[PDB]
Design a protein around this ligand. Structure first.
Ligand SMILES: N[C@@H](CC(=O)O)C(=O)O
Ligand SMILES: N[C@@H](CC(=O)O)C(=O)O
Ligand SMILES: [Cl-]
Ligand SMILES: [Cl-]
Ligand SMILES: [Li+]
Ligand SMILES: [Li+]
Lengths: 262, 262
């Protein structure tokens, strides 16, 4: 029953986990910085464990293949026994809750629209009623699944377009989506979680923005393999850190103190 | 192992649970209406149980006495075996999570400031720096505990004032707090959760408003006695109802379709 170093799976997603510019000079956990790097240190301190940060091998959040039923991404790392905990912007969803355990949420968010500044779109309804401006989502995460499973008219219409659009409107990483918005001269809009959208709006070159309200409301949770004894302590730590204002401090540190757009 | 009617504890708090105007003509669950009445019906349908709504006897959310260590309110009803589930705007907190089980949250909120229109206050900092305008909170809930336990300078200053203020700035129910704001000619401001503040701002006589940002961020959860077998199904139902847009529909029904202030 010896104490064992906890293997943490996480994902390179700004400002949650980022490679320090000089990462090749550094070793181990010191290579990384961000909101989730700081949160991992706090959770570990409050739960009394030592840990090793690892970046998910496939760069994905996690989805299940319809035919093989195999989970990929961080969810897969937990499900198949490769990691002990995921500390990442991992959205709590019904399908995931059935296969992994989640803390109460450490951050709230909703799906939102990113545009290149000046794009004549203000809402999901606006996007759904036109095709000149292409729009899409990240693969292998909760946002794509939201559209695929929606029975709400506007979102069904959006999914109906996205699933058949040529060329593909889907991207492998948030960075790819943002690059496509920036390089498409207003002819691509990107659907992504409000947290990431709000961060990117305050980073140079300051050419994107969030428009409209959020399309839904949900949260990120710290995930553990189903039935793991670590889950109880981690959940209490999230609640304690929230109540002591630490999560709000980290939000301010990594979003608004990081603002470059004045 | 016979199916047993589930006893639901809840609280009279608008627009979550309200007595219908003609309640004396009605019996049982039909006496009540509101967001949590609708949510209870949906949760029960998705979990396959029958239920009886009961209003918490002491009219309280739930706190533990420092000396006797006895829990009151809805929390007490669960802890001492008087109810099987609480379906109410019951805030998920560390101290409660240790004694009862909670679903993932069904609604997000934060502590907020209610003023009578025209009161010269825009922030918690503003309140903390003066005493002409008295301010307080509800007894026996999470908002009072937030201030009592805060180590954040502005909130500690506020608690330092509130705890010794004469006459008392604390109230037994939200309705009492709102009445005091309305009747105090701008000389009382009330600290309460944003959800309730936003509802009341859209009800006649349309003389109150929310000012400033929220002071914190947290959620309401459906609560069960610790270890209850019902908790798993209830949690999945909350997630499913969120994902299918039902919670958003209920929010719109009970807040904005209920708007009387045009
Ligand atoms: N945070 C999301 C990523 C997305 O799909 O927007 C997830 O957990 O899958
Ligand atoms: N909803 C809160 C009430 C409050 O204190 O504002 C609770 O659960 O205690
Ligand atoms: Cl948040
Ligand atoms: Cl919400
Ligand atoms: Li939601
Ligand atoms: Li928070």
């Amino acid at each position: 029953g010896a104490n064992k170093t906890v293997v943490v799976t996480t994902i390179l997603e700004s400002p949650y986990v980022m490679m320090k510019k000089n990462h090749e000079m550094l070793e181990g956990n010191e290579r990384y910085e961000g909101y989730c790097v700081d949160l991992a240190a706090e959770i570990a301190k409050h739960c009394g464990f030592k840990y090793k940060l690892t970046i998910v091998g496939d760069g994905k959040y996690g989805a299940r293949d319809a035919d093989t039923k195999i989970w990929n991404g961080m969810v897969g790392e937990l499900v198949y026994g490769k990691a002990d905990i995921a500390i990442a912007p991992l959205t709590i969803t019904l399908v995931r809750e059935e296969v992994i355990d989640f803390s109460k949420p450490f951050m709230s968010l909703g799906i939102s629209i990113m545009i290149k500044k000046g794009t004549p779109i203000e809402s999901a309804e606006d996007l759904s009623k036109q095709t000149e401006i292409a729009y899409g989502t990240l693969d292998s995460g909760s946002t794509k699944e939201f559209f695929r499973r929606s029975k709400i008219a506007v979102f069904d219409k959006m999914w109906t377009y996205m699933r058949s659009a040529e060329p593909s409107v889907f991207v492998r990483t948030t960075a790819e989506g943002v690059a496509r918005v920036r390089k498409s001269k207003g002819k691509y809009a990107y659907l992504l979680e409000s947290t990431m959208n709000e961060y990117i709006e305050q980073r140079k070159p300051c050419d994107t923005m969030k428009v409209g309200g959020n399309l839904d409301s949900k949260g990120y949770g710290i995930a553990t393999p189903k039935g793991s004894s670590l889950g109880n302590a981690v959940n209490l730590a999230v609640l304690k850190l929230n109540e002591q204002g630490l999560l709000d401090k980290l939000k301010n540190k990594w979003w608004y103190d990081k603002g470059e757009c004045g």
